[PDB]
């Protein structure tokens with residue numbers, strides 16, 4: 280259910296060399312300079328890869344695009360960080376650039392004023408004490424399936440994930456719309472504006488740095504949590520709908536029994552068709568955030584310097600779609 284590409288050694292080396300050159304020339308990934316240049320620099324990537332990315336993006340069926348075979352030297356990389364705050368290590372630097380280059384073939388990258396201090400290139404890694412939270416730094420508790428930033432109309436079209444390391448093979452989970460089992464009445468209800476989708480816990484003040492707690496954009500998160508507006512779960516074509524739902528943060532509209540039954544049914548059908556995608560070291564996946572929901576299986580964290588670690592990036596097909604949420608910065612979204 281995903282499109283797959285495997286780099287040849289020559290292609291992988293060329294891509295790595297390009298990223299390393301970018302890392303030498305630009306101060307950081309999230310600076311305005313590299314954000315503007317990356318989409319043009321990505322034109323220098325191996326031709327066969329560019330062809331795959333162009334064609335896979337135009338395909339109507341896949342839930343994700345996967346590129347296998349980027350080399351990652353664990354010794355050069357260094358230890359997995361204890362927190363995302365300290366995670367921009369020299370060892371991971373070139374791979375962050377590589378991820379942004381691939382992302383540049385698919386769309387415009389952005390972040391959130393209220394998640395990981397407004398960073399564009401973010402980190403997924405287990406944090407000690409947060410094993411049973413509902414955020415991506417969980418471990419022992421399975422990360423429930425969701426549309427990334429399901430609450431927001433400016434959520435990504437694609438979610439990019441590059442696996443820096445994953446020694447114990449922990450699976451990302453994926454599921455599409457369970458179209459073979461949804462009856463037309465239930466389908467009809469899911470297409471109607473009868474559902475509440477609150478922001479997930481990654482947007483909470485306590486999950487950002489103490490110096491950021493005063494940011495005005497947290498007010499907008501509070502309003503979305505306190506007073507969510509009724510929206511549809513399914514949109515577009517009835518035979519190939521787009522999907523907007525979060526398994527832990529969605530609810531029916533108040534007193535709406537038909538919507539409740541429809542959401543209950545959907546949960547059950549998504550649970551039943553959830554499948555696994557293991558991102559091994561050096562794998563990059565771009566998950567279609569409109570066709571599919573995703574999560575991550577429960578795992579026992581190591582906390583020994585070699586924990587599973589991904590770089591992550593939100594991607595949109597059109598940055599100008601979200602101008603209302605441009606928070607004094609077009610690549611960092613949030614509202615009063």
Ligand SMILES: N=C(N)NCCC[C@H](O)[C@H](N)C(=O)O
Nearest residue numbers: 413414415423425479481527
């Ligand atoms: N537990 C759920 N159903 N949803 C939580 C949302 C998870 C997202 O990836 C979030 N941006 C994060 O990184 O924590």
Ligand SMILES: [Fe+2]
Nearest residue numbers: 425427573574
């Ligand atoms: Fe996610």
